[PDB]
Amino acid sequence: KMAFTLADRVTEEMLADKAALVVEVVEENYHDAPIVGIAVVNEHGRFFLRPETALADPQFVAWLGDETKKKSMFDSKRAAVALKWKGIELCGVSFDLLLAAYLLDPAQGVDDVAAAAKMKQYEAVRPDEAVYGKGAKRAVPDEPVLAEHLVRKAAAIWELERPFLDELRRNEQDRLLVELEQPLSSILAEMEFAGVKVDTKRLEQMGKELAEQLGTVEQRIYELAGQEFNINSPKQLGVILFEKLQLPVLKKTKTGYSTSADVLEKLAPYHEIVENILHYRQLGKLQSTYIEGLLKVVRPATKKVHTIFNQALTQTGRLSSTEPNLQNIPIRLEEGRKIRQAFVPSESDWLIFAADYSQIELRVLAHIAEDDNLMEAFRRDLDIHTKTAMDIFQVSEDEVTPNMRRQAKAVNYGIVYGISDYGLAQNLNISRKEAAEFIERYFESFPGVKRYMENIVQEAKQKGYVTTLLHRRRYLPDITSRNFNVRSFAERMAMNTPIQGSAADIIKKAMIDLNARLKEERLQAHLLLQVHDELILEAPKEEMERLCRLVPEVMEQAVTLRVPLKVDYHYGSTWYDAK
DNA sequence: CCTGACTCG
DNA sequence: TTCGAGTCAGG
Structure with a gap:
């Protein structure tokens, strides 16, 4: 039982300074996709509007782009981008239920309002799939049915905002939502469009x-x-x-x-x-x-x-990229790397600028493990792969061959991924006895890391979840399973997720910080892509000089750890050439 | 639709 | 028997 007005023109009471807003885009890929209906819930009532009407209404457009008129939404980036393609600006989004649900528990895989509403036992809204159907059957229902669905989704957002904020605050995740994920969402919207x-x-x-x-x-x-x-x-x-x-x-x-x-x-x-x-x-x-x-x-x-850029999908806090995936463009073999010559600046006399963190996950390990030997290596800016090679081969720096350094490299990241002697032996195609010695020597040489790996698994068992630098969580209910395989996988997640997730936290903050500085200085440079531990921009050739100093600085200073952060950078006429 | 390839971080 | 992702062809 839910009353609403199926409006045919926009009225003043629909334009309150706080509302739940639904701007419905049903196609999975929302680029240049139809907006099929709009709903508004606020202090004054519940309203459904036809897009053809409301998006051509100067009063409603003005309200949409008014930052002081606050909207609560679900997946505000989808709405924001679909509106960009219609030539309309969306501002004032103060709460995004998708991102709120994602931070509370990424394992739920929340991807519609009904799935989020279930987290608080709110059941007065239907799942999108139930209303639209699946596959070849997918279709927009008759207007009264569509209108009730959109209004119910808006009404759910309206009632769920405070419960979700309360739980996030309780979890030390309220700032993670409002100061990181929500601002990042607008930046991603810019990049995508x-x-x-x-x-x-x-x-x-x-x-x-x-x-x-x-x-x-x-x-x-x-x-x-x-x-x-x-x-x-x-x-x-x-x-x-x-x-x-x-x-x-x-x-x-x-x-x-x-x-x-x-x-x-x-x-x-x-x-x-x-x-x-x-x-x-x-x-x-x-x-x-x-x-x-x-x-x-x-x-x-x-x-x-x-x-x-899917912001509410990965279990670690990373982004993913779809249709197309621009985060797995080839680079490692020259034959594939040439694909990157086809990615070019959008304007004449612009250039591609690409900046990457050096070894960010190993620096995060050094910080969180508080391993003095590892921390000191980074303090001196010693090559971390060469240092490990000295320890696992038990030789001096001069005696470290390129292939020894290669094997030490595999041990260094393999530790972060929970590698066993078997996996390492297979990886390097070496003796399993030798691989096992590499790992033992590694942990003997970096006891702080050994202790951290032990401690983080114990913590996961005791609390039921692990956490990142900026208080992102991942729950690990399998960590006490009696089954070796199930338990071992969860222990490796305990080891790895804080590392990958903390690195995610850092670059996300760097994107927010970098964008602020770009606008402050009225630079034309802007972000195109993020690739987990790197940022890709384009800019007029005249701005390279500034970017060469600004981008690395902002990225290295995004957060302060117990070891320094290092960023490398390059620019050129294509993505290929920015090397 | 699933599995197992190749691709990236 | 090493972590996090997406897309593709084959079946």
């Missing part, structure tokens, strides 16, 4: 040459195999490798023989075909995903791609 320009002529030429190369590699594979087969089918491949060519079976999964890259690499002393197959599968992912998949999402008139 701006998009990144693509050189489609270059990308298409790369595609044509790549198709040629693919065919050649493919034919060479069939010649080595003695037969044609679908190389992209691990099942057919497994038959060729492990039945026809009788290569050793190093690993199986529940579906059959493994053909993972790690396995195929280890089979190179038995047959040369496995190196060719690895190459083929690399080339084929470049073609399918970074040529074809990317061209499919380029907006043809502007040649821009517009990612969506």
Whole structure:
């Protein structure tokens, strides 16, 4: 039972200085997507408005963009961006129920108002899926049904705001919401709407040459195999490798023989075909995903791609990036790295500027573990991979070979990911006895880290959750499971999540701080992407000088740890060249 | 729709 | 038997 006005014009009482607001975009990808309905709940009542009416109404547009008129919403970034595409500015968002629910427990996977309302036993609203349907059945219902749904969602936000704020404050997470996640949401909205320009002529030429190369590699594979087969089918491949060519079976999964890259690499002393197959599968992912998949999402008139940064998805506090994912563009092998030449500035005589934190997760470990040996290495700015190599090989710095440093590098990050002697041995393709010694030597050399790893797991068991620098939480109900596998996975999460999550906290704050400084100085430079521990901007070439000092400073000073933060930076004519 | 590839941090 | 993500082809 919920009364509301299905309005056909906007009225003054709909424009109160505090309201719950629903601006409904039903398509998952909200870029240039239709706004299907609006609802407003406030001191005076409950209202549904037709977009065609309200978004052409100067009074309502004015209210939307009035920062002193405060709106509570769910997924305000979706609304903000969909309104940008309609040429309308949204300001004054003071509470976002999606972000509030996300901070309280990311494991719930809240992605609609009803799922958030369930956290407080509020059931006077339906799930979106129930109203719109699934898949090919998805559709906007008749107006009265749509209107009641939107109003119920607004009414839920109105009543849930204080309960959610109260619990966040209780959890030491209220400032995390209002001073970090909510401001970051507006910045992400800017980045998404701006998009990144693509050189489609270059990308298409790369595609044509790549198709040629693919065919050649493919034919060479069939010649080595003695037969044609679908190389992209691990099942057919497994038959060729492990039945026809009788290569050793190093690993199986529940579906059959493994053909993972790690396995195929280890089979190179038995047959040369496995190196060719690895190459083929690399080339084929470049073609399918970074040529074809990317061209499919380029907006043809502007040649821009517009990612969506999911801010309320990951369990650690990171962002993710979808349709397209611009956080996994190739860089590690030169063949793929060239894809980055197709990402260019949106204006003439602008440049790409890219800044990355150096070893942020190891510095966070050093801080949280309060390990003096690790802290001192960073204080002196010694190479942390070379230092570990000295300890695990038990040699002097001069005796550390590049391959020893490489193995020490694997130990350094592997510790942060909970690696075992088995995993390390497989990773480095070395003796498991030697891998085990590397790890023992590591923990003997960094006792503060050993103690931290022990202590954090105990804390998780005692409290039921672990926390980051800025009070983000992750609950770990499995941490006391009697089952070894389930428990071990949760213990590794206890070790890793505070580290990855704290690093997330830092760069998020850096983005807020950097943006403030950009606007203060009236620079034209602006953010395009975040890639976990790096920030990518574009700017007129004239501003590089300033950015070279401003960006690293702001990023290094975002938070103060017990070790210093270090940021590297580069710029150039394309993303590729910003190296 | 799932699994197992490749891609990044 | 090393953490957090997304997309793709095959089945």
